[PDB]
Write a structure and sequence with these properties.
This is part of a larger assembly, with chains A (89 residues) and B (153 residues). Helix content of chain A is 64%, strand content 4%. Chain A contains 6 helices and 2 strands; from the N terminus they run H-H-H-E-E-H-H-H. In chain A, strands 1-2 form a two-stranded antiparallel sheet. In chain A, a hairpin with a 2-residue loop joins strand 1 and strand 2. Chain A is mostly helical and 89 residues long. In chain B, helix 4 packs antiparallel against helix 6. Chain B contains 6 helices and 2 strands; from the N terminus they run E-H-H-E-H-H-H-H. With 153 residues, chain B is mainly alpha-helical. The chains are: A mainly alpha (89), B mainly alpha (153). Chains A and B meet through helix 6 of A and helix 6 of B. Chain B: One of its GO terms (biological process) is proteasome storage granule assembly.
């Protein structure tokens, strides 16, 4: 549970950590187990550097397609339409 | 106004009621003195109604080609700026009158209250009318700009 909480945090801070630092924060005892966890966490570690950049952006783009969706996103167009029918009721 | 002679003969024998039989009785009685005297002693005045077909009505009623297009035409923006500024400023000056008014104006005798605290040319009401007219407009203003941008591109 500790590993998932920390994993979340470290994205918002930075994009690049060396191999050693990833292991130390998340408290793995094996460096290879570190890189393995990174794939399972859907992070690519390349040449000793994490590239948090990919998945995070991808997720937001995926979230953006759903259905609930117009009033939750809030349209400026909708603001005029809702204001009028209040008055005229 | 429309008129039809009366005969002198009709008035002399006092036979004039014949001409005013079975009617709703609505007569225009505007214009008197010499004019009315002459009318009574010479003609009869009766109503004018206007009948028109709905074909005629529609042709007239129809306006420009650009009439049904105007909502994406919009005001020059320098004037919307001017108007926004004018309304905020004006209400401030009438708001002074309104604050003074409800200092007191809770005594008795209606007309006196209106002279003492300047309840004539009433500030609350004149303010409520201006505030709303400007408010409605500003909804229209935004509505056009957003729509123009998005529809075309």
């Amino acid at each position: 549970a500790i590993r998932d909480e920390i994993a979340k945090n470290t994205e918002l801070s930075y994009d690049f950590l060396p191999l050693s630092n990833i292991k130390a924060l998340l408290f793995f005892n094996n460096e290879k187990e570190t890189e393995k966890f990174a794939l399972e966490r859907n992070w690519p570690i390349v040449n000793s550097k994490v590239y948090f950049n990919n998945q995070s952006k991808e997720k937001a783009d995926y979230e953006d397609e759903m259905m609930h969706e117009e009033d939750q996103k809030t349209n400026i167009i909708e603001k005029a339409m809702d204001y009028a029918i209040s008055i005229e009721n | 106004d429309a008129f039809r002679l009366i005969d002198t003969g009709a008035l002399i024998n006092n036979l004039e009621p014949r001409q005013t039989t079975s009617n709703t009785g609505l007569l225009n009685k505007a214009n008197i003195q010499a004019l009315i005297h002459g009318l009574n002693r010479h003609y009869y005045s009766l109503n004018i109604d206007y009948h028109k077909t709905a074909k005629e009505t529609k042709m007239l009623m129809n306006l420009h080609k650009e009439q049904w297009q105007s909502g994406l035409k919009m005001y020059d923006y320098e004037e919307k700026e001017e108007s926004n500024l004018a309304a905020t400023k004006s209400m401030v000056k009438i708001a002074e009158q309104y604050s003074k008014r409800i200092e007191e104006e809770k005594e008795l005798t209606e007309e006196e209250l209106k002279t003492r605290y300047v309840g004539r040319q009433d500030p609350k009401k004149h303010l409520s009318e201006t505030a709303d007219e400007t408010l409605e407009n500003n909804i229209v203003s935004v509505l056009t700009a957003g729509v123009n941008s998005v529809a075309i591109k």
